[PDB]
């Protein structure tokens, strides 16, 4: 869902 997708994108953008 939208909430889960936002968390995914958020943290993926901070990856090594």
């Amino acid at each position, epitope marked *: 869902n939208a909430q889960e997708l*936002l968390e995914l*994108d*958020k*943290w*993926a*953008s*901070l*990856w*090594n």
Partner: antibody, heavy 111, light 115 residues
Framework: QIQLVQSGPELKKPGETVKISCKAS????????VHWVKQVPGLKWMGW????????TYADDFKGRFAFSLESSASTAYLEIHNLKNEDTATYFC??????WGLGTTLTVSS | LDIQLTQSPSSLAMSGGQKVTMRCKSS????????????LAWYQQKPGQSPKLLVY???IRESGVPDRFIGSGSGTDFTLTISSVQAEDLADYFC?????????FGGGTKLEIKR
């Protein structure tokens, strides 16, 4: 929950080395990059370190005298500046990418 | 080529309760086609303090940040609005693009009291 704790103010003479620590908590240290930013009373991006491999990447203006390192088991990132010059006087921040900034460490270079 | 960010105005003299608007223009689109997020964040910084995240992915307010703060825009043009500005909002504000390295910061907007 997320915290970045930096070491205290530093006073250094020209030509010296300073080592600034950034101790991370509240998340998996090795999953996300740590960035370093310089601020003189605007902001300048210095580069980042890969917290999994330890590989540093430096911005063009920070290529010779600057070193990023890790003590991964302590969830700590380090910034070293060698051959200190008067222009290095500033506040240095570590950051968990764009998400969270450390409180900063001030550095004064003076004879 | 390095992404340039132009922030305006560099200074703004405010009155409590007014709508405050500041803008960030990038030299290249900050929109990631793979996830449709814009890689721009806005921060508040008070004297002798560290930057605090206000808005991320251009338009998403950070949790805990008062609802008077609003980000908008897409591609190359972004804005931060403070809908009813408060004395406690006196601070510097700046944008950050984290689309590509080197990351780049806008020159900042300094809010002051008008008199």
């Amino acid at each position: 929950q997320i915290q970045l704790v930096q070491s205290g103010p530093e006073l250094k003479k020209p030509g010296e080395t300073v080592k600034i620590s950034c101790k991370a908590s509240g998340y998996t240290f090795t999953d996300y990059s740590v960035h370093w930013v310089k601020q003189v009373p605007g902001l300048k991006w210095m580069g980042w370190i890969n917290t999994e491999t330890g590989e540093p990447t430096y911005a063009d203006d920070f290529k010779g005298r600057f070193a990023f390192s890790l003590e991964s088991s302590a969830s700590t990132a380090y910034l070293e500046i060698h051959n200190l010059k008067n222009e290095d006087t500033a506040t240095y921040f570590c950051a968990l990418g764009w998400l969270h900034w450390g409180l900063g460490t001030t550095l004064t270079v003076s004879s | 080529l390095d992404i340039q960010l132009t922030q305006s105005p560099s200074s703004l003299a405010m009155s409590g309760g007014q709508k405050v608007t500041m803008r960030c223009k990038s030299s290249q689109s900050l929109l990631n086609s793979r996830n449709e997020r814009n890689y721009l964040a806005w921060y508040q910084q008070k004297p002798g303090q560290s930057p605090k995240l206000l808005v991320y992915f251009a338009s998403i307010r950070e949790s805990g940040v008062p609802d008077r703060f609003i980000g908008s825009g897409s591609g190359t043009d972004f804005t931060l609005t403070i809908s009813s500005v408060q004395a406690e909002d006196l601070a510097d504000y700046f944008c950050l693009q984290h689309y590509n390295t080197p990351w780049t910061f806008g020159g900042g907007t300094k809010l002051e009291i008008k008199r």
